[PDB]
RNA sequence: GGAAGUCGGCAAAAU
RNA sequence: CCCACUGUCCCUAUCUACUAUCUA
RNA sequence: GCCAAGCGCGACGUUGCUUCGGCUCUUCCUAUCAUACCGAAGCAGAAUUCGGUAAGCGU
RNA sequence: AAUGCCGCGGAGCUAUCAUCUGCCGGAUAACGGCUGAACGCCUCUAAGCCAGAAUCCGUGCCAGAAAGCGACGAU
RNA sequence: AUGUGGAACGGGGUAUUGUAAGCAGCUGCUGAGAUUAAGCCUUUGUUCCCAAGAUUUG
């Protein structure tokens, strides 16, 4: 778990994603981010200084896992092609013309499986399975169409938000086949994936998350 | 608020009645004054998408009205041009009922978001449905 | 650079020409002039519409996959515009001379 | 921080390297200085350096000298409640009177019990108009004795007067 | 109390003199007998009224500033009782009440008295009046102000203690090697002396340990620090760290330092105690040599124990031009074949069709 | 009211801008001009990349409105020494060339038709027949006057302009030694000098002419008007068939737009694209001239690179920037 | 804010003329000069 | 936008 | 008081006739 | 009242006790609310307080 | 059909309902100093000299003396 | 005061409106027709016009 705040913001999820194969950044911004997420994953994984739409919420626009990536379809072909060209020839990028263009922020995808909002469209759902190549479960986080911002999903462990019941709580972690842990990150900012991102060997989370919570996102993905 | 927000087509004057996007309950905001004005003669206060001015809940549940506090307009009606040159029109006039430090009081916003709204805002991002 | 089609005229729409309108099932409308755009807001069916496309295509009248640059298949692209269009106006021409027939 | 924490910072780091000499050469100048802005200076600055110096020679000169022997119809003045043909306001209406005894020199509060006579006008001492050289009784119980009142209560705001005694 | 937040108490003298400025910069100053007797009147009970209010407004201030004895927290309250006589306090807030009462009081009056003023003599000799009056008051009222005032400079010195959280008092024989073991656990460093009674204040430091935040008081030697030491030790949720010399290098016998250990067990009680057994190598019994400086980290461990169980991009930019005038360059963070062409731009759209969006 | 800096408000006593203040001379710069003349034309609107450090469109594109001002190369007829004297500056002395073309001589006359067309045949007589008195006068120039200024004029009939009169004017020779001056005036006489040569389209520099004239209000317009910090984005060149076709965009075509530049007509010769407005209407002569005072802030200092210049039909809702592309998206006309 | 005439700011302008100007605009004029 | 104008829905439009 | 409405207002802009202007 | 340098007063000190009324507008003054720069203060930092220059610019 | 009514409508006008642009030098006040006497020491001051405010004076911008003027062309 | 001269029309470009009259069996001729400088652009198109009156000036 590393600490760190892009500009003046805790919300770290919300200017950049993080996925098991690729990182992307904002770009327009302060390089200080983009430097500290290339040296704790610059060796390991790419990573591209980038927008999507023209704006710094690419990290809540943009879902997908290390085997393929989705971006709005509010995105620019120059921006596409520049995503393509930065981004490893089989590390696959697909546009998505869905009706909710916040990709980030309605599914919350892992390596194996994923998990999507309610409302996803047929045509979204089979372009995610063929793309991802994950299972795609319709439900929904905490009683929360945001099922993407309000949940953090990961290869060893998940985060949700700490008003979940216990029986839903098991009955979602069954699901992902993973372990969750029903908590707040941020001192209490309950968008998990917002204000945290975990990768399957590394996490960052904002400088205002507080050291109980550092403690157990660490406990809960064994890094 | 996060980031510079360019100069806008300003449309939302006071005494304004505004529809409430938000899954809050309420279903009318009025507008009492607006944040960051100059000191410009018999000049009326206005918002814009994407600015945080003093609302009062007018429909909605009991608690929630009679509170002269932050709303931030998401949708206008008013046509504006943005720096790209195309220009963009709302049906309606939305806002979302906010806490002063810039936290969504809700959990879920109905209806399209402007971009740079969602670019202003990073809670209103991670909160928004799409942002077209 | 996306030159884009006009809901209503399906004409070519550049940067800065006419207007921009999102609609509540996020469903975006671009018009190309404000003649257009007018012809909409009254909601006129363009295939009922005498000088859309729309109309001159049903009544006889008429990637989203990023790929990686190269050089040579820009320049084969280029090249390959140009003789479609031709070919394309030869077949237009040779239509307009069957329907004046 | 705790406490004297500067006196924490000057114990473990030091004082300002030039302070001393700083300090030293602002109390060299202070005279130039005093000098200088006796004359520049005017208005009501000037005044109050112009009493302000007077009263610090004064004092400086005596310490000196302590040093070598070691070595409408309305009624318009203050008073004290057909006849009443004009009207006297209650706030200029005065009903206790700060006496200052002659023998004992001591100023006391007693109740106006009422005029005696006021020289300017027997309808003003029928009014009880409190005014300058008026004879007025009041209460000396806890010291009924008559006063000549010294002041002007129509300007000074009190009903200051001295004990006939 | 321990908040500070107080402007500094300027002098009598100053204060008079910045109420009696301030009142003839803002008001008006030009007053001829051409003007009606109303106008007159006016201006005298304009220039009378800013007067009370200027005179108000700084003293509700000065009383608003010092914090109330009672509402303070049990151990504030005698800290500050033993350290600067509550009592003598609250009797100088009440007299500073009290003539502000009076300067009120005696504001009203001259304003009612000058409302039927007769003449521009009249009026003067009325404006004059009140404002002699308030100086009178302001000069009276001039042992207090210099008492609030060395109040204020020593809360503002105090510490803003924390006794609701976990915390550990260090109390005991002076230099009894407490003070050097809470200056190595804690980021603050309280100063040692030879002389007895070094630390006559409390000192607090915060601390980190598994996890938990840690408030380490330090206590004077066991006076005004004694009893002040007493009085924190008496209402606090902490965990006594009492420091017993070992080898007696602190001038204080063992069997001494076990009778003040024993007489002070009264303030000790329903605490975790711990014994500090000092200079080992010159009620929990721990060896920690203060010479040799072992077993500090284990004893503050055990003690933490005991309570708890008791409760680069960024430097190529700066380099080259720094934030804000650097533009950096996403070509050639490519990953394409070959390098002209990823240095190369390409036509986005061309004879009205986009050449990217059809190749 | 407005600013009191601009009163009197009154007419402009020129139609053509004239440049009140010349950049500062310096010796060690080598000889070179300041300033131009220029017709203006209209204006596009164009998208360009957003290369601006620290700013929240960095690298992104924007659509700006840009002048277009048509710059026929200015054909130098002349030169003036200036001798500064305890009163101001001086002419000393003039000396033109020999070969004047009718443009210029059109300057001279009210009324040039019924003229006699006398201008400057004695001076070109004694021109041709002794020299000694042009090398005396030259000398005389770069001997005694401290500051030379060139006399150019304009080749009206390159522009669509009904108008033939040349605007004469003087651009100020600022750099090098007053006989370097001399010396570049004299090769360059009869010449003609290149609004490429003198401004390179990625500097800073003022625009100053006469205002458009609102008619009467309760005096207002056709004044003079100085705009300082009107960036260059091109200086295309007239023969060149891809002087409004950038590198992403390609679509060999000109500058003006389908259907004509309104009220003024088809641009031919090298023109200058300006961001923003500038002062004056269509087709009314503009002056241009360099940087006074050295300030090249990110915006004045930044690269420029255009994407696509639009050429629609400004004359109606013109949606074809070609008639080409017209022809290959509508269907066959009749015709 | 400082305005325009802040004599601070006028010595930063006159430190950074001979840092981000001067020289690049001379050669600049030198090149179009050449030609 | 909708009476925020003015001491004020005066006049218009709404019906 | 609520609802609706509108250039009363933010903040004015455009058009038309007459007036206004000059000539005998 | 007590002193009281001094020339019977007697300064500074000391004892008591307490019809008018307001909208717009134009400029102007600084006796400065903000902006700019300084000085001082237990003024750590931040946020202040007091005091100078200062009517350019707003209010 | 006094411009009968309705939709669109160029051109023009127009909109912080649209868009562009808004500058540099010294001299000072407060104040901080340097050298330095007066006054064998000292002292920012007396003679001298720096630093220094959105202040001042210029530059830039507008007007051009309609009784200020120059160079030049023709006659 | 005879010329890349000017003016009248005309053609072309460009624009606005929305498929004209008329013919045939809503469809086709028909994005045709109409208007297009009156402060749009252009013209190897047609015709016409001008190589003057008066005034003042060393």
Redesign the pocket.
């Given at each position: 778990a590393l600490r760190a705040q892009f500009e003046n913001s805790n919300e770290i999820g919300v200017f950049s994603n993080l996925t098991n194969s690729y990182a992307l950044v904002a770009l327009g911004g302060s390089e200080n981010f983009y430097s500290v997420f290339e040296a704790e994953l610059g060796d390991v994984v790419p990573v591209v200084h980038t927008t999507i739409g023209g704006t710094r919420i690419i990290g809540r626009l943009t879902c997908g896992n290390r085997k393929g990536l989705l971006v709005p379809s509010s995105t620019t072909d120059n921006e596409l092609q520049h995503l393509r060209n930065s981004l490893p020839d089989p590390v696959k990028i697909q546009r998505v013309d869905e009706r909710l263009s916040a990709l980030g922020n309605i599914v919350a995808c892992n390596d194996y499986v994923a998990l999507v909002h309610p409302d996803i469209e047929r045509e979204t759902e089979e372009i995610i399975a063929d793309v991802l190549d994950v299972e795609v479960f319709r439900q929904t986080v905490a009683g929360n169409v945001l099922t993407g911002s309000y949940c953090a999903l990961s290869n060893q462990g998940a985060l949700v938000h700490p008003r979940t019941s216990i029986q839903e709580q098991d009955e979602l972690s069954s699901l992902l086949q993973v372990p969750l842990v029903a908590g707040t990150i941020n001192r209490g900012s309950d968008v998990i994936g917002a204000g945290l991102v975990v990768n399957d060997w590394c996490a960052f989370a904002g400088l205002d998350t507080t050291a109980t919570e550092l403690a157990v996102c660490e406990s809960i993905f064994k890094l | 608020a996060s980031g510079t927000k360019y100069?806008?087509?300003?449309?939302?004057?006071?005494?304004?009645?505004?529809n409430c996007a938000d899954n809050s309950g309420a279903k009318n905001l009025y507008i009492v004054s607006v944040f960051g004005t100059g000191?410009?003669?018999?000049?009326?206060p206005?918002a814009s998408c994407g600015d945080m001015v003093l609302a009062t809940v007018?429909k909605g549940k009991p608690d929630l009205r009679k509170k002269i506090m932050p709303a931030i307009v998401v949708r206008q009606?008013?046509?504006?041009?943005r720096?790209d040159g195309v220009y963009l029109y709302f049906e309606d006039?939305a806002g979302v009922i906010v806490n002063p430090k810039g936290e969504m009081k809700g959990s879920a916003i109905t209806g399209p978001v402007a971009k740079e709204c969602a670019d202003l805002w990073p809670r209103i991002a991670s909160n928004a449905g799409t942002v077209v | 650079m996306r030159v884009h089609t006009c809901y209503f005229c399906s004409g070519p729409v550049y940067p800065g020409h006419g207007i921009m309108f999102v609609r509540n099932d996020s469903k975006v409308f671009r018009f190309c002039?404000?003649?257009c755009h007018?012809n909409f807001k009254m909601k006129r069916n363009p295939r009922k519409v005498?000088?859309?496309?729309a109309?001159?295509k049903a009544?006889?009248?008429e990637r989203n996959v990023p790929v990686r640059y190269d050089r040579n298949v820009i320049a084969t692209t280029l090249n390959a515009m140009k003789r479609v269009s031709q070919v394309h106006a030869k077949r237009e021409r040779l239509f307009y001379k069957k329907?004046?027939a | 921080?705790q406490?004297?924490?500067?006196?924490?910072?000057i114990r473990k780091h030091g004082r300002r390297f030039d302070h001393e000499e700083?300090k030293?050469?602002?109390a060299?100048?202070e005279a130039?200085?005093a000098?200088?802005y006796a004359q520049?200076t005017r208005?009501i600055?000037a005044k109050l350096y112009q009493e302000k110096r007077?009263?610090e020679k004064?004092?400086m000169?005596?310490t000196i000298?302590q040093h070598e022997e070691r070595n409408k119809r309305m009624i318009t003045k203050a008073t004290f409640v057909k006849y009443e043909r004009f009207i006297r306001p209650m706030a200029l209406r005065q009903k206790?009177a700060?006496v200052?005894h002659?023998e004992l020199?001591?100023?006391?509060?007693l109740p106006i019990i009422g005029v005696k006579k006021n020289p300017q006008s027997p309808t003003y001492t029928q009014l009880g108009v409190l005014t300058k050289g008026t004879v007025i009784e009041v209460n000396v119980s806890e010291l009924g004795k008559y006063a000549q009142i010294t002041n002007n209560p129509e300007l000074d705001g009190?009903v200051?007067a001295?004990l006939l005694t | 109390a321990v908040f500070?937040?107080?402007?500094?108490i300027?002098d009598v003298n100053?204060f008079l003199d910045?109420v009696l400025?301030?009142t003839?910069?803002?008001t008006?100053?030009?007053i001829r007998s051409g003007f009606?007797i109303?106008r007159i009147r006016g201006f005298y009970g304009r220039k009378v009224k800013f007067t009370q209010d200027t005179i108000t407004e700084k003293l509700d201030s000065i009383l608003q500033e010092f914090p109330k004895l009672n509402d303070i927290h049990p151990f504030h309250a005698d800290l500050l009782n033993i350290l600067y006589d509550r009592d003598h306090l609250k009797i100088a807030l009440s007299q500073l009440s009290t003539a502000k009462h009076?300067v009120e009081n005696?504001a009203r009056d001259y304003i009612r008295l000058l409302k039927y003023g007769d003449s521009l003599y009249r009026c003067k000799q009325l404006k004059r009046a009140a404002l002699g009056?308030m100086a009178?008051?302001i000069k009276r009222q001039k042992s207090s102000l210099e008492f609030l005032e060395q109040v204020?400079?020593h809360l503002?010195?105090l510490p803003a203690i924390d006794p609701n959280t976990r915390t550990l008092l260090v109390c005991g024989y002076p230099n009894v090697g407490k003070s050097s073991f809470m200056n190595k656990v804690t980021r603050a460093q309280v100063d040692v002396q030879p002389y007895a009674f070094t630390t006559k204040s409390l000192f607090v430091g915060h601390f980190d340990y598994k996890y938990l935040r840690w408030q380490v008081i330090d206590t004077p030697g066991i006076n005004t620090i004694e009893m002040q030491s007493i009085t924190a030790m008496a209402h606090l949720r902490s965990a006594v760290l009492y420091f017993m010399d070992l080898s007696e290098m602190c001038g204080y016998s063992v069997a001494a330092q076990v009778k003040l250990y024993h007489s002070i067990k009264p303030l000790f009680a329903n605490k975790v105690t711990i014994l500090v057994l000092n200079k080992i190598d010159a009620v929990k019994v721990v060896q920690t040599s203060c010479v040799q400086d072992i077993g500090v980290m284990d004893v503050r461990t055990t003690a933490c124990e005991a309570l708890l169980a008791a409760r680069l991009a960024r430097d190529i930019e700066a380099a080259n031009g720094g934030a804000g005038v650097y533009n950096v360059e996403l070509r050639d963070k490519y990953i394409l074949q070959d390098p002209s062409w990823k240095y190369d731009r390409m036509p986005e759209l061309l004879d009205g069709k986009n050449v990217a969006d059809f190749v | 009211?407005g600013s009191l800096?601009?009163?009197?408000?009154?007419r402009?006593?020129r139609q053509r801008?004239k440049?009140?203040?010349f950049p500062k001379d310096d010796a060690s710069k080598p000889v070179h001009l300041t300033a131009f003349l220029g017709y203006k034309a209209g204006m596009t609107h164009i998208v360009r990349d957003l290369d601006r450090p620290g700013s929240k469109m960095h690298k992104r594109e924007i659509l700006?409105?840009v002048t277009v001002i048509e710059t026929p190369p200015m054909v130098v007829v002349g030169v003036?020494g200036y001798v500064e004297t305890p009163?101001?500056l001086?002419?000393?002395?003039?000396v033109?060339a020999e070969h004047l073309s009718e443009e210029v001589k059109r300057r001279?006359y009210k009324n040039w038709?019924?003229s006699?067309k006398?201008?400057?045949?004695?001076?070109?007589?004694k021109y041709a027949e002794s020299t000694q008195s042009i090398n005396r006068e030259l000398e005389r120039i770069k001997k005694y006057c401290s500051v030379v200024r060139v006399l150019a004029h304009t080749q009206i009939?390159?522009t669509?302009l009904?108008q033939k009169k040349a605007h004469l004017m003087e651009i100020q020779v600022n750099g090098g030694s007053v006989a370097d001056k001399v010396e570049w005036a004299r090769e360059h006489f009869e010449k003609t000098v290149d609004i490429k040569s003198t401004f390179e389209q990625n500097e800073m520099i003022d625009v100053?002419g006469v205002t458009?004239g609102?008619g009467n209000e309760g005096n207002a317009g056709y004044?003079?008007?100085?705009?300082?910090?009107?960036?260059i984005y091109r200086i295309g060149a007239g023969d060149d068939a891809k002087n409004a076709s950038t590198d992403f965009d390609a679509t060999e075509k000109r500058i003006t737009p389908?259907?004509?530049?309104?009220?003024?007509?088809?641009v031919e010769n090298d023109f200058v694209m300006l961001?923003?407005?500038t002062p004056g209407?269509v087709k009314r002569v503009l002056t241009l001239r360099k940087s006074?005072?050295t300030?090249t802030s990110r915006?004045?200092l930044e690269p420029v690179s255009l994407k696509w210049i639009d050429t629609?039909?400004?004359?109606?809702?013109?949606?074809?920037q070609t008639?080409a592309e017209?022809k290959q998206?509508?269907?066959?006309?009749?015709? | 804010?400082?305005?325009?005439?802040?004599?601070?700011?006028?010595?930063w302008?006159?430190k950074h003329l001979k840092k981000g100007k001067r020289a690049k605009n001379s050669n600049f004029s030198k090149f179009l000069k050449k030609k």
């Amino acid at each position: 778990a590393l600490r760190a705040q892009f500009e003046n913001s805790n919300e770290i999820g919300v200017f950049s994603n993080l996925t098991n194969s690729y990182a992307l950044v904002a770009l327009g911004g302060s390089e200080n981010f983009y430097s500290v997420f290339e040296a704790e994953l610059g060796d390991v994984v790419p990573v591209v200084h980038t927008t999507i739409g023209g704006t710094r919420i690419i990290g809540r626009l943009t879902c997908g896992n290390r085997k393929g990536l989705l971006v709005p379809s509010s995105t620019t072909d120059n921006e596409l092609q520049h995503l393509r060209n930065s981004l490893p020839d089989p590390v696959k990028i697909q546009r998505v013309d869905e009706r909710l263009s916040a990709l980030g922020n309605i599914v919350a995808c892992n390596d194996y499986v994923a998990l999507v909002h309610p409302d996803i469209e047929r045509e979204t759902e089979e372009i995610i399975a063929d793309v991802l190549d994950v299972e795609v479960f319709r439900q929904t986080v905490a009683g929360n169409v945001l099922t993407g911002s309000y949940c953090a999903l990961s290869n060893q462990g998940a985060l949700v938000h700490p008003r979940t019941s216990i029986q839903e709580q098991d009955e979602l972690s069954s699901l992902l086949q993973v372990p969750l842990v029903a908590g707040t990150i941020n001192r209490g900012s309950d968008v998990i994936g917002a204000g945290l991102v975990v990768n399957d060997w590394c996490a960052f989370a904002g400088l205002d998350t507080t050291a109980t919570e550092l403690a157990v996102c660490e406990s809960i993905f064994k890094l | 608020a996060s980031g510079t927000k360019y100069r806008m087509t300003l449309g939302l004057p006071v005494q304004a009645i505004m529809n409430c996007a938000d899954n809050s309950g309420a279903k009318n905001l009025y507008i009492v004054s607006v944040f960051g004005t100059g000191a410009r003669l018999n000049r009326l206060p206005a918002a814009s998408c994407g600015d945080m001015v003093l609302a009062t809940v007018k429909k909605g549940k009991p608690d929630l009205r009679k509170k002269i506090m932050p709303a931030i307009v998401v949708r206008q009606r008013k046509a504006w041009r943005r720096k790209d040159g195309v220009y963009l029109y709302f049906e309606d006039n939305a806002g979302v009922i906010v806490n002063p430090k810039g936290e969504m009081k809700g959990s879920a916003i109905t209806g399209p978001v402007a971009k740079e709204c969602a670019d202003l805002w990073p809670r209103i991002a991670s909160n928004a449905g799409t942002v077209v | 650079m996306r030159v884009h089609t006009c809901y209503f005229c399906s004409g070519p729409v550049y940067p800065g020409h006419g207007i921009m309108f999102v609609r509540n099932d996020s469903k975006v409308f671009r018009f190309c002039r404000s003649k257009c755009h007018k012809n909409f807001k009254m909601k006129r069916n363009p295939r009922k519409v005498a000088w859309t496309k729309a109309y001159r295509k049903a009544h006889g009248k008429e990637r989203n996959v990023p790929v990686r640059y190269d050089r040579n298949v820009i320049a084969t692209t280029l090249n390959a515009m140009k003789r479609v269009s031709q070919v394309h106006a030869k077949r237009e021409r040779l239509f307009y001379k069957k329907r004046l027939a | 921080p705790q406490n004297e924490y500067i006196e924490e910072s000057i114990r473990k780091h030091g004082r300002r390297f030039d302070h001393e000499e700083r300090k030293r050469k602002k109390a060299a100048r202070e005279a130039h200085d005093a000098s200088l802005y006796a004359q520049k200076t005017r208005g009501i600055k000037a005044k109050l350096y112009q009493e302000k110096r007077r009263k610090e020679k004064i004092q400086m000169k005596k310490t000196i000298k302590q040093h070598e022997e070691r070595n409408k119809r309305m009624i318009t003045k203050a008073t004290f409640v057909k006849y009443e043909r004009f009207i006297r306001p209650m706030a200029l209406r005065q009903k206790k009177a700060n006496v200052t005894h002659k023998e004992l020199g001591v100023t006391m509060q007693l109740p106006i019990i009422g005029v005696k006579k006021n020289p300017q006008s027997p309808t003003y001492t029928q009014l009880g108009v409190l005014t300058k050289g008026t004879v007025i009784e009041v209460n000396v119980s806890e010291l009924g004795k008559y006063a000549q009142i010294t002041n002007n209560p129509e300007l000074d705001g009190c009903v200051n007067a001295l004990l006939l005694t | 109390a321990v908040f500070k937040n107080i402007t500094p108490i300027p002098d009598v003298n100053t204060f008079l003199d910045v109420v009696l400025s301030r009142t003839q910069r803002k008001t008006p100053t030009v007053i001829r007998s051409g003007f009606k007797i109303s106008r007159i009147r006016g201006f005298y009970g304009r220039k009378v009224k800013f007067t009370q209010d200027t005179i108000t407004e700084k003293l509700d201030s000065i009383l608003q500033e010092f914090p109330k004895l009672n509402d303070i927290h049990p151990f504030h309250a005698d800290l500050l009782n033993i350290l600067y006589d509550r009592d003598h306090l609250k009797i100088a807030l009440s007299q500073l009440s009290t003539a502000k009462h009076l300067v009120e009081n005696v504001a009203r009056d001259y304003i009612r008295l000058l409302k039927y003023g007769d003449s521009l003599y009249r009026c003067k000799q009325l404006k004059r009046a009140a404002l002699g009056r308030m100086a009178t008051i302001i000069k009276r009222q001039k042992s207090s102000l210099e008492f609030l005032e060395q109040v204020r400079q020593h809360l503002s010195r105090l510490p803003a203690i924390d006794p609701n959280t976990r915390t550990l008092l260090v109390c005991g024989y002076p230099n009894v090697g407490k003070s050097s073991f809470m200056n190595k656990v804690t980021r603050a460093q309280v100063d040692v002396q030879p002389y007895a009674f070094t630390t006559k204040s409390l000192f607090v430091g915060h601390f980190d340990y598994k996890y938990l935040r840690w408030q380490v008081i330090d206590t004077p030697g066991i006076n005004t620090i004694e009893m002040q030491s007493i009085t924190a030790m008496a209402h606090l949720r902490s965990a006594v760290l009492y420091f017993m010399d070992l080898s007696e290098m602190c001038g204080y016998s063992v069997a001494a330092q076990v009778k003040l250990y024993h007489s002070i067990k009264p303030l000790f009680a329903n605490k975790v105690t711990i014994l500090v057994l000092n200079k080992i190598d010159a009620v929990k019994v721990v060896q920690t040599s203060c010479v040799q400086d072992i077993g500090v980290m284990d004893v503050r461990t055990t003690a933490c124990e005991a309570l708890l169980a008791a409760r680069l991009a960024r430097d190529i930019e700066a380099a080259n031009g720094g934030a804000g005038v650097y533009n950096v360059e996403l070509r050639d963070k490519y990953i394409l074949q070959d390098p002209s062409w990823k240095y190369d731009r390409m036509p986005e759209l061309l004879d009205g069709k986009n050449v990217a969006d059809f190749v | 009211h407005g600013s009191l800096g601009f009163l009197p408000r009154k007419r402009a006593s020129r139609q053509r801008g004239k440049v009140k203040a010349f950049p500062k001379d310096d010796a060690s710069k080598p000889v070179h001009l300041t300033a131009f003349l220029g017709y203006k034309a209209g204006m596009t609107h164009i998208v360009r990349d957003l290369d601006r450090p620290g700013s929240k469109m960095h690298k992104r594109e924007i659509l700006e409105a840009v002048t277009v001002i048509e710059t026929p190369p200015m054909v130098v007829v002349g030169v003036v020494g200036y001798v500064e004297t305890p009163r101001g500056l001086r002419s000393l002395t003039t000396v033109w060339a020999e070969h004047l073309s009718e443009e210029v001589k059109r300057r001279f006359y009210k009324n040039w038709f019924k003229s006699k067309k006398k201008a400057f045949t004695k001076y070109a007589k004694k021109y041709a027949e002794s020299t000694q008195s042009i090398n005396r006068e030259l000398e005389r120039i770069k001997k005694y006057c401290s500051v030379v200024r060139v006399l150019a004029h304009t080749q009206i009939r390159k522009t669509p302009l009904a108008q033939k009169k040349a605007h004469l004017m003087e651009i100020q020779v600022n750099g090098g030694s007053v006989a370097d001056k001399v010396e570049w005036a004299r090769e360059h006489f009869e010449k003609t000098v290149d609004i490429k040569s003198t401004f390179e389209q990625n500097e800073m520099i003022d625009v100053i002419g006469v205002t458009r004239g609102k008619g009467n209000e309760g005096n207002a317009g056709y004044m003079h008007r100085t705009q300082l910090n009107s960036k260059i984005y091109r200086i295309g060149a007239g023969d060149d068939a891809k002087n409004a076709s950038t590198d992403f965009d390609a679509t060999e075509k000109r500058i003006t737009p389908m259907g004509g530049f309104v009220r003024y007509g088809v641009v031919e010769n090298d023109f200058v694209m300006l961001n923003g407005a500038t002062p004056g209407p269509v087709k009314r002569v503009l002056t241009l001239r360099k940087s006074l005072l050295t300030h090249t802030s990110r915006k004045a200092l930044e690269p420029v690179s255009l994407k696509w210049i639009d050429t629609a039909s400004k004359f109606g809702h013109g949606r074809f920037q070609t008639p080409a592309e017209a022809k290959q998206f509508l269907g066959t006309l009749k015709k | 804010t400082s305005g325009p005439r802040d004599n601070n700011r006028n010595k930063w302008a006159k430190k950074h003329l001979k840092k981000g100007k001067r020289a690049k605009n001379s050669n600049f004029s030198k090149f179009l000069k050449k030609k």
